[PDB]
């Protein structure tokens, strides 16, 4: 949740679960019979939780009780993949598998769509919207990180690199973009195609997949396909500590808003919560 670290939610092959940070017992679950959700996102001020599923439907469920508030039908052909909520939360942005990015104007009375239905040949994996909520960046599977004006739904300047891209993120109060991909390389990019440093975070066959940052850009934590997870100092690309002991491919790593810990979710069912280093505060 935005500016809240006491609870955290995980989507499953079938059912969403919520968990408490201090004690890791289940708090609540949302159950769906034979569908899997992607990119579950909290919406601020305690509104409903949003998920997109295999069949292409979007569903919103209330926090306290497991009742759906609304459903979006036939949103995407093969299932919604990425979701992002604007700060003022009148509109939601979603990404489909068959290269499309769509915008829905939610309203307490009704659900409407005003996407330009942009073309994007690769499935999305990460969509971010900056602080002023004006600009929205989306990563592709086929190798393009496209930035969208979100006002006129135009200006196709997109960052070019030949691999299956992965998580992208804005720098805190900056125009720099930190992105990862199938190539075992962390690549900084700029609005002017500027690359400050070019990391080469390479295992033997360990594809770096997830990224997270501090509120102040002191360090960023990176999780690869390999079992090991590491965090890099932002100013200079040097390892500080390391994280191992996982089984399989770590896929997502988040940092709590208070940043007293890092959580990581493992492909085979393992959840790891990490005590952040002291001298990063």
């Amino acid at each position: 949740p935005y500016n809240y670290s006491d609870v955290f939610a995980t989507c499953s092959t079938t059912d969403i679960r919520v968990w408490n940070a201090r004690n890791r017992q289940e708090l609540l679950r949302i159950q769906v019979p034979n569908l899997e959700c992607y990119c579950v996102t909290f919406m601020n001020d305690g509104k409903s939780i949003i998920s997109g599923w295999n069949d292409g439907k979007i569903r919103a469920f209330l926090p306290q009780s497991g009742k759906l508030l609304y459903v979006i039908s036939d949103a995407h052909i093969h299932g919604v993949t990425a979701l992002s909520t604007t700060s003022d939360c009148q509109r939601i942005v979603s990404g489909g598998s068959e290269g499309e990015v769509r915008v829905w104007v939610i309203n307490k009375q009704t659900q409407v769509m005003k996407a330009s239905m942009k073309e994007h040949r690769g499935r999305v994996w990460s969509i971010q919207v900056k602080k002023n909520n004006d600009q929205a960046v989306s990563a592709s599977a086929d190798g393009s990180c496209i930035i969208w004006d979100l006002k006129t739904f135009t200006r196709l300047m997109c960052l070019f690199e030949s691999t299956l891209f992965k998580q992208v993120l804005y720098h805190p109060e900056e125009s720099q973009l930190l992105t990862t991909g199938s190539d075992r390389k962390i690549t900084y990019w700029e609005i002017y195609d500027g690359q400050a440093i070019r990391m080469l975070d390479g295992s033997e066959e360990g594809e770096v997949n997830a990224l997270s940052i501090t509120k102040e850009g002191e360090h960023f934590v990176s999780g690869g396909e390999d079992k090991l997870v590491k965090l890099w100092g932002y100013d200079e690309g040097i390892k500080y500590y390391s994280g191992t002991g996982h089984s399989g491919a770590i896929t997502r790593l988040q940092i709590s808003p208070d940043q007293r810990t890092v959580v990581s979710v493992g492909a085979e069912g393992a959840i790891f919560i990490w005590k952040m280093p002291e001298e990063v505060v």
Partner: peptide
């Protein structure tokens, strides 16, 4: 009453 995430953990 309004159901909110913050309302969890009484």
């Amino acid at each position: 009453e309004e159901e909110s995430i913050y309302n969890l953990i009484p």
